[PDB]
């Protein structure tokens, strides 16, 4: 049972990530649609904006770099900054009440040095107290629903039984 829930005002899941590497476009689009109170951002268009030269055929395989996350943000009137680690429960609480969007940067949990890391971006939605414990609420673009994270943990248990480490965030959307 939920004792307290604090989410971004106008956040709504509107599209879902399938066979492309556009998780940062999905996350930025959802955060910007939330803070700007619109439905006019979408993953495809953002990735197209980031990769003007790339053929339609090859666009699905384009991924996103940190500098693009910050510069795209700037073009939309947002001052984005990187923060290492997981944000605290109180920091998320303030940012969410202040209508400021947080993008999660996550990396797959690697078995040994030869096992390549996979990168994935997600959107923070807010925070909650559930059964007396502090939680962060997040949206994985692979999914059509929200997820719950122990605020004291950087280990994300994503759908399809995939674990990722939340290593840092881009704050300011």
């Amino acid at each position: 049972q939920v004792q307290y829930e604090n989410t971004l005002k106008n956040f709504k899941i509107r599209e879902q990530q399938f066979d492309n590497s556009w998780c940062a476009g999905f996350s930025m689009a959802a955060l910007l649609n939330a803070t700007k109170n619109t439905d006019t951002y979408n993953a495809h268009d953002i990735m197209r904006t980031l990769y003007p030269e790339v053929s339609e055929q090859d666009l699905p395989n384009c991924a996103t770099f940190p500098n693009q996350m910050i510069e795209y943000g700037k073009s939309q009137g947002r001052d984005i900054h990187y923060q290492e680690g997981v944000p605290s429960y109180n920091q998320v609480d303030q940012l969410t009440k202040d209508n400021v969007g947080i993008m999660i940067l996550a990396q797959s949990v690697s078995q040994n040095p030869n096992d390549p890391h996979l990168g994935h971006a997600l959107a923070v939605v807010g925070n909650a107290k559930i059964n007396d414990q502090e939680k962060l609420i997040y949206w994985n673009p692979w999914d059509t629903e929200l997820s719950i994270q122990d605020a004291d943990s950087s280990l994300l248990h994503l759908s399809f039984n995939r674990d990722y480490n939340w290593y840092g965030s881009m704050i300011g959307y």
Binding site: F18, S21, A63, L118, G119
Partner: protein, 109 residues
């Protein structure tokens, strides 16, 4: 009509443990996804095959293999075993942050 992707995995069984070979073999066969209208044909090819992919990692603990094609070394394919009639295929960009949803493929016959 569906789109068909051939995946000719090139590797030398003499160099793999029995468990590594068992894991790769989980994925060999023909598989389909109705939503994408796309099918994949996974075989153990050889050095004169077309559509060659090489193995990057075999994860016996999680029943998962990662591999990539010489045609585009910037995309990593990740296959995960789901059950007897299904596998999951995911792609991830080698540079930058971006990894697809695992896509479910069901065994063709």
């Amino acid at each position: 009509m569906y789109q068909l992707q051939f995946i000719n995995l090139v590797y030398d069984t003499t160099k793999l443990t029995h468990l590594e070979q068992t894991n790769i073999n989980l994925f060999i066969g023909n598989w389909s996804n109705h939503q994408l209208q796309k099918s994949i044909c996974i075989r153990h090819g050889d050095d004169t095959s077309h559509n060659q992919y090489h193995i990057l990692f075999i994860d016996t603990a999680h029943q998962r293999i990662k591999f990539s094609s010489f045609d585009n070394e910037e995309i990593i394919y990740i296959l995960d075993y789901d059950d007897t009639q299904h596998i999951l295929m995911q792609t991830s960009s080698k540079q930058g942050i971006g990894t697809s949803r695992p896509i479910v493929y069901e065994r063709l016959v």
